[PDB]
Design an enzyme around this catalytic site. Structure first.
Site, PDB file in Angstrom:
ATOM      1  N   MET A   1      28.022  44.410  48.594  1.00 21.49           N
ATOM      2  CA  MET A   1      28.101  43.429  49.678  1.00 21.49           C
ATOM      3  C   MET A   1      29.459  42.724  49.711  1.00 21.49           C
ATOM      4  SD  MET A   1      24.820  41.319  50.990  1.00 21.49           S
ATOM      5  CE  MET A   1      24.945  40.746  52.708  1.00 21.49           C
TER       6      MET A   1
ATOM      7  N   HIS B   1      33.035  38.646  50.850  1.00 20.75           N
ATOM      8  CA  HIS B   1      31.838  39.090  50.140  1.00 20.75           C
ATOM      9  C   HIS B   1      30.703  38.080  50.267  1.00 20.75           C
ATOM     10  CE1 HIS B   1      32.574  36.279  46.809  1.00 20.75           C
ATOM     11  NE2 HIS B   1      33.840  36.643  46.859  1.00 20.75           N
ATOM     12  N   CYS B   2      29.492  38.585  50.060  1.00 20.42           N
ATOM     13  CA  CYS B   2      28.307  37.747  49.953  1.00 20.42           C
ATOM     14  C   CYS B   2      28.388  36.961  48.646  1.00 20.42           C
ATOM     15  CB  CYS B   2      27.056  38.618  49.996  1.00 20.42           C
ATOM     16  SG  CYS B   2      25.505  37.718  49.929  1.00 20.42           S
TER      17      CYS B   2
ATOM     18  N   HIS C   1      24.844  40.370  44.253  1.00 19.67           N
ATOM     19  CA  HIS C   1      25.064  40.807  45.643  1.00 19.67           C
ATOM     20  C   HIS C   1      26.358  41.575  45.794  1.00 19.67           C
ATOM     21  CE1 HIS C   1      21.786  38.639  47.979  1.00 19.67           C
ATOM     22  NE2 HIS C   1      21.480  38.583  46.695  1.00 19.67           N
TER      23      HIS C   1
ATOM     24  N   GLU D   1      54.666  53.838  41.330  1.00 13.14           N
ATOM     25  CA  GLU D   1      53.836  54.985  40.977  1.00 13.14           C
ATOM     26  C   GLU D   1      52.392  54.549  40.988  1.00 13.14           C
ATOM     27  OE1 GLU D   1      54.370  56.551  36.829  1.00 13.14           O
ATOM     28  OE2 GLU D   1      55.380  54.617  36.498  1.00 13.14           O
ATOM     29  N   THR D   2      52.144  53.377  40.432  1.00 11.24           N
ATOM     30  CA  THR D   2      50.804  52.849  40.267  1.00 11.24           C
ATOM     31  C   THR D   2      50.940  51.348  40.359  1.00 11.24           C
ATOM     32  OG1 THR D   2      50.173  54.668  38.731  1.00 11.24           O
ATOM     33  CG2 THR D   2      48.795  52.695  38.656  1.00 11.24           C
TER      34      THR D   2
ATOM     35  N   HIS E   1      21.207  35.944  52.223  1.00 12.28           N
ATOM     36  CA  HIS E   1      22.615  36.347  52.138  1.00 12.28           C
ATOM     37  C   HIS E   1      23.512  35.316  52.832  1.00 12.28           C
ATOM     38  CE1 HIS E   1      21.370  40.424  50.859  1.00 12.28           C
ATOM     39  NE2 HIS E   1      20.493  40.397  51.848  1.00 12.28           N
TER      40      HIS E   1
ATOM     41  N   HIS F   1      37.750  35.171  51.571  1.00  7.05           N
ATOM     42  CA  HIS F   1      38.917  34.678  50.833  1.00  7.05           C
ATOM     43  C   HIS F   1      40.082  34.271  51.738  1.00  7.05           C
ATOM     44  CE1 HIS F   1      37.964  36.762  46.724  1.00  7.05           C
ATOM     45  NE2 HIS F   1      36.967  36.009  47.164  1.00  7.05           N
TER      46      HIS F   1
ATOM     47  N   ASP G   1      31.468  34.797  52.210  1.00  6.48           N
ATOM     48  CA  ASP G   1      32.612  34.037  51.732  1.00  6.48           C
ATOM     49  C   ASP G   1      33.832  34.902  52.115  1.00  6.48           C
ATOM     50  OD1 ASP G   1      34.820  33.204  49.924  1.00  6.48           O
ATOM     51  OD2 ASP G   1      33.413  33.086  48.231  1.00  6.48           O
TER      52      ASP G   1
ATOM     53  N   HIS H   1      46.706  54.945  42.703  1.00  4.45           N
ATOM     54  CA  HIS H   1      47.792  55.865  42.545  1.00  4.45           C
ATOM     55  C   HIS H   1      47.537  57.043  43.467  1.00  4.45           C
ATOM     56  CE1 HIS H   1      50.906  58.089  40.292  1.00  4.45           C
ATOM     57  NE2 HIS H   1      50.176  59.127  40.642  1.00  4.45           N
TER      58      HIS H   1
ATOM     59  N   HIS I   1      43.860  54.890  38.460  1.00  2.78           N
ATOM     60  CA  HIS I   1      44.525  55.601  37.369  1.00  2.78           C
ATOM     61  C   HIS I   1      44.116  55.143  35.971  1.00  2.78           C
ATOM     62  CE1 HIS I   1      47.426  58.148  35.422  1.00  2.78           C
ATOM     63  NE2 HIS I   1      47.850  58.606  36.582  1.00  2.78           N
TER      64      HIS I   1
HETATM   65  O1  LIG Z   1      35.123  33.846  46.668  1.00  2.00           O
HETATM   66  N1  LIG Z   1      34.808  33.679  45.299  1.00  2.00           N
HETATM   67  O2  LIG Z   1      34.124  34.442  44.634  1.00  2.00           O
HETATM   68  O1  LIG Z   2      49.106  61.713  38.379  1.00  2.00           O
HETATM   69  N1  LIG Z   2      47.759  61.318  38.560  1.00  2.00           N
HETATM   70  O2  LIG Z   2      46.934  61.195  37.667  1.00  2.00           O
HETATM   71 CU   LIG Z   3      23.929  39.178  49.915  1.00  3.83          CU
HETATM   72 CU   LIG Z   4      35.379  35.644  45.930  1.00  6.83          CU
HETATM   73 CU   LIG Z   5      48.822  60.425  36.929  1.00 13.62          CU
END
Ligand SMILES: O=N[O-]
Ligand SMILES: O=N[O-]
Ligand SMILES: [Cu+2]
Ligand SMILES: [Cu+2]
Ligand SMILES: [Cu+2]
Ligand SMILES: O=N[O-]
Ligand SMILES: [Cu+2]
Ligand SMILES: [Cu+2]
Ligand SMILES: [Cu+2]
Lengths: 333, 333, 333
Positions: A143, A128-129, A138, A272-273, A88, A93, A91, A248, A299
């Site tokens: 992960m 993440h891995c 992974h 809303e979303t 493992h 970001h 990474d 949401h 949603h």
């Molecule tokens: O961080 N790149 O998958």
């Molecule tokens: O309003 N939520 O699905």
């Molecule tokens: Cu891993």
């Molecule tokens: Cu990434």
């Molecule tokens: Cu909704």
């Protein structure tokens, strides 16, 4: 000169909870120290008893939320105990260089490493891995997690005024691709290596079998519901390392939303979303105005209610009839 | 009066490279002349030897990037040689009227046409073939590219100050739907017409078999990796004519991103990952700070690493230990 | 004190048309009264005769667009006649509390209810049915629409200046998951309850069979095309209750776009294509400059042209050769 900065050791907590921190930085830049232990383990992900070999940072899916301030140094000690079976790495970001750290953090079972990087950009980021030739396997085995780099003066609204949260929660959304037999039943395996060949085929359909918050169907429901009170200001951080989601809050809104999660940008208001692209972490700020049960969902409502991407908030306080009221309760015509 | 404007003939270059141009316009409005020749050809898209009948502008997938300035006139000569077998046309998302040009540019094999349109909106835009009743088939056979309409005073940041790139690259991301036999092997055909009926069925699953940059798995890797140096300012233009993508530079960021690609809008800052909606071109600006290999990916990591949506940057210069360093290299506990 | 506010009864109209309203509010806050009747009915959705049991607000898919102003009170009377067979309710994304109203509006066949809520946030919002344990089934059977809450001073551009539309249309985009036999033919059922078990399986594939505007393949084409003239300012409201879409006007642009539909945010300018996340309503403003036929599409072009997500605008007026012209019409080389 990093030799001369203050250091602080932070102990992580299990999602959806977040370790203690200050919003507005009280000290100058520091070296913030974290330790994570990798843990491969069997995980039960639904009510029918479906089992996978999860791959975890610190025993949870997602891995824990780390919180630092802009221009802090993150020093992570990453341990891969010899009870694990796979290589493992990690990474971030949030980090600049060497594939986010992945090229410098490759640990076989029985190894450890310590990485340091400077948090030069404020925002919430995925970590993440990502081991060479096995990246999606992974990641989609759980992960991944997130790190939050707060501006030194905290969060601000679209007009540059302070935003202060009373509670923060971390929802890590996970897409799983469990292999199936001819009839549609999920397969079980004794080890992760054993599952590998089927897992690759299951991933190539691009169709998850389960999409869950906090590692399981219904994990953030019942007694594990998130809590708040009317009048409390809540920050919900949400990550998806592999696939787009659209959170949401049923009965609410995102008052201020950073959908792609980068705090030098002004927030979107009154959502809303909102779309969090796969490989991204986002944050939404909401002030609760009504008590009761809220659902928090992806949603795509099939993803939410059929495949598992649904949690609850239980909110206490007084009902406000001005915002909403039942004029005539359901009755016979 | 178009009769009186200056004209300039531009010769296009193969992606990921971009033809020479000025960022800040040095002349007034001009009629900019381009010629594209359509070419239907067999294309090998993966390492296993999978073959398709690609449909191309100028022999590449994607077709070449055109660069003009706001309020220039684009005059395109489009040639469909009699060695081709299908009707083609061109729809520019940058253009106003007549389905983006598609209704005026229908050419059978052996025909040519010349279209002119005014570039009234700055941004990066998709162009693609779009013949009536066969639109997705042409697009998903690789018949799409992009055009960039620069503001006359160049790019600017969120505070209205100049942004200047040292290098520009064009990544055209393509979703392919190769027909399959009962067992899952890819089919081969002698001609495009021959593939049509199966192609429609393969498209209806909504599940691509391959997602590639620059027309093939691994096309932007090895010796075809993109290059830059520490301290260089790079503009990456990215298009997807049919399907959503979420680019991400592993080990980097998008310092300034126009995810939907329209330059009258301020950029988003500090993006880890951003969503380019299907039918859109986006641009990301980044200043490299560390040397080494970077991967540039669609951050659905199954799409990236299993289906082909992954390229590299090879970056030269000095490593900066302040941004990142390995404190304790992987070793035994 | 709600007792003392003025009231106005509004009669809804069938999509894509919108009931009469004022853009700039002429009165103070009011209680705006609406009535919807639920109607379960057989619906034919394609040219081959595919039939489903749609679940509707007011007999249409989508349900009608409601229009109010910020800080109005919406008072909805919701009627579920005893000719229907299922429990229904309504969740407004515009509303605060009680799952958007869903917890207070559960009506069995033969029942009615009246809900009131305050429209505290301006924007376009989705409303949809959401009965406990059956949410995606109701939504994806067509039981969703939208509400627009205008700012009291109307729409404004990115610089705070007034935007005024001459025409408004509502496009409700619907993803359908029609069950299939072994060979791929669509199944028919005598009642909705009868379809339930198959419907759940069809939904779990995450792959719609049809994606349509205004309830059917080709519903907004031919004589049901949307109309406008050169020089008219058009507002297009677009909702998707379940799934991401990416609208695009072929031959045009979104001059001002609120992709996530919330009007306290400045619009994005000059969009070719924009992403409306599932569970969201968006709005695009465009001034037509050329006459002719435009297509309005989800720019996943497979979704558009194979599965049904495509409509037309027929626009009258004079052609402008300065914006576009055919220099040399298609001819032999
Ligand atoms: O961080 N790149 O998958
Ligand atoms: O309003 N939520 O699905
Ligand atoms: Cu891993
Ligand atoms: Cu990434
Ligand atoms: Cu909704
Ligand atoms: O340019 N419309 O596909
Ligand atoms: Cu073509
Ligand atoms: Cu197009
Ligand atoms: Cu219903």
């Amino acid at each position: 000169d990093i030799s001369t900065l203050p250091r602080v050791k932070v102990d992580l907590v299990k999602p959806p909870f977040v370790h203690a921190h200050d919003q507005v930085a009280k000290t100058g830049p520091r070296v913030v120290e974290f330790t994570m232990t990798i843990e491969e383990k069997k995980l039960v992900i639904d009510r029918e008893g479906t089992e996978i070999h999860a791959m975890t940072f610190n025993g949870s899916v997602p891995g824990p939320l780390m919180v630092v301030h802009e221009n802090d140094y993150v020093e992570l000690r990453l341990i891969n105990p010899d009870t694990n079976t796979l290589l493992h790495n990690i990474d971030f970001h949030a980090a600049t260089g060497a594939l986010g750290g992945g090229a410098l953090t490759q640990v076989n079972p029985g190894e450890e490493t310590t990485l340091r990087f400077k948090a030069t950009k404020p925002g919430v980021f995925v970590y993440h891995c990502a081991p060479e030739g096995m990246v999606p396997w992974h990641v989609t085995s759980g992960m991944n997690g997130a790190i939050m780099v707060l501006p030194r003066d905290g969060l601000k609204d679209e007009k540059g005024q302070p935003l202060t949260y009373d509670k923060i929660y971390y929802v890590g959304e996970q897409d799983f691709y469990v292999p199936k037999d001819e009839a549609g039943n999920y397969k079980k395996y004794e080890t992760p290596g054993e599952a590998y060949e089927d897992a690759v085929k299951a991933m190539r359909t691009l169709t998850p079998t389960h999409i869950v918050f906090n590692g399981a169907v219904g994990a953030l429901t019942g007694d594990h519901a998130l809590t708040a009170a009317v009048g409390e200001r809540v920050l919900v951080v949400h990550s998806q390392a592999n696939r787009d989601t659209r959170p949401h809050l049923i009965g609410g809104h995102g008052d201020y939303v950073w959908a792609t999660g980068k705090f030098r940008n002004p927030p979107d208001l009154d959502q809303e979303t909102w779309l969090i692209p796969g490989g991204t972490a986002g944050a939404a700020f909401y002030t609760f105005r009504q008590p009761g049960v809220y659902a928090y969902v992806n949603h795509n409502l099939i993803e939410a209610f059929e495949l598992g991407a649904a949690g609850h908030f239980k909110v206490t306080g007084e009902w406000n009839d001005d915002l909403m009221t039942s004029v005539v309760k359901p009755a016979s015509m």
